[PDB]
């Protein structure tokens, strides 16, 4: 197991032999597996440290913010339309979890989502409001998307929903692995269409690196109460925790600022390293 201790150090004395473990060849493509006992005299040490905290499960066992959505309940004495929020599910709106995940090419994991809701008043008027309730609805691809805050789509005969009362514990749910491949693709080197000579130029065009492998629907959030005389503005923060995670094909981590949802970089951000003299400690 990951909590198993690391190997002990062994005592070694002076040596005089033809075999040379120090010299090697890196052109082969391998790494020399030397231990301290091959170059200096060492003593016997009983090892106690372990690598339990660097496992893949431990490296991802935190909740990371993936988005902040905004809703409001407007004043009754205005003409503004009530605002409801729509968000397309993705982990690429933020940088920390994105950088942690893109250490690898493929991954499988179950997900755990937590919702933290906060609210505030917008006008100095002493007007009041009663406790609010929020509806969070998951709309998979191909399902009807709401257009008004109170149209029929919110009946949720088949779409799962959460009803959350303000001031209680933050909401939480769990999701399984729901991909149509055998693993999630962090990178995709291809297109979705192949242009054809007979067809027109515009009929074969598509974006580079975009595929329907990464279409998971949207989350729609509304305030279920009817408007009060005073406006109330609310923000919902979404936190994502991956669990039971497996990864494949490690990659170097990002070194420059992210620019969009691809591997593109922006001019003026391509100097990640600082100055240091060659013979200075």
């Amino acid at each position: 197991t990951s909590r198993d201790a690391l190997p002990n150090t062994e005592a070694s004395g002076p040596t005089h032999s033809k075999e040379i473990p120090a010299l090697t060849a890196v052109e082969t493509g391998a790494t020399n597996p030397l231990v301290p006992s091959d170059t200096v005299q060492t003593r016997h040490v009983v090892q106690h440290r372990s690598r339990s905290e660097s496992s893949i499960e431990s490296f991802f066992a935190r909740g990371a913010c993936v988005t902040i959505m905004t809703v409001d309940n407007p004043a009754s004495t205005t003409n503004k339309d009530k605002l409801f929020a729509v968000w397309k599910i993705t982990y690429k709106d933020t940088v920390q979890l994105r950088r942690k995940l893109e250490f690898f090419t493929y991954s499988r994991f179950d997900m755990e989502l937590t919702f933290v809701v906060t609210a505030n008043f917008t006008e100095t008027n002493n007007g009041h409001a009663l406790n609010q309730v929020y509806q969070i609805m998951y709309v998979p691809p191909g399902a009807p998307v709401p257009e008004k805050w109170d149209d029929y789509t919110w009946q949720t005969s088949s779409n799962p929903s959460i009803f959350y009362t303000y001031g209680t514990a933050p909401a939480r749910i769990s999701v399984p692995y729901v991909g149509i491949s055998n693993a999630y693709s962090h990178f995709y080197d291809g297109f979705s269409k192949v242009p054809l000579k007979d067809q027109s130029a515009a009929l074969g065009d598509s974006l580079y690196g975009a595929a329907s492998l990464n279409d998971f629907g949207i989350l729609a959030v509304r305030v279920v109460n009817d408007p009060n005389p005073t406006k109330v503005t609310s923000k919902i923060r979404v936190y994502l925790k991956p669990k039971h995670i497996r990864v494949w094909c490690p990659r170097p981590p990002r070194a420059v600022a992210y620019y969009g949802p691809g591997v593109d970089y922006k001019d003026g951000t391509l100097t990640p390293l600082s100055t240091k003299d060659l013979t200075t400690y």
């Binding site: 709309v139 191909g142 399902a143 009807p144 789509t153 949720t156 088949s158 779409n159 979705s192 329907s212």
Partner: protein, 58 residues
């Protein structure tokens, strides 16, 4: 849904030979078509349809 990455393919019908009839017979006819699934067919991720809607309650 309509998607380029998971498109299914194409289906068509052609004349191998022509249609032949004798005299005193109708020269135009009809064909009917049906579709169904096999025993290895499955679905998942229940959702809502766009084939029904409403404007007023009851």
């Amino acid at each position: 849904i309509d998607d380029s990455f998971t498109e299914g393919g194409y289906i068509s019908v052609f004349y191998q030979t022509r249609i032949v009839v004798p005299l005193s017979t109708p020269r135009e006819m009809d064909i009917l078509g049906f579709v169904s699934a096999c025993n290895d067919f499955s679905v998942r991720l229940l959702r809502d349809t766009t084939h029904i809607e409403q404007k007023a309650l009851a």
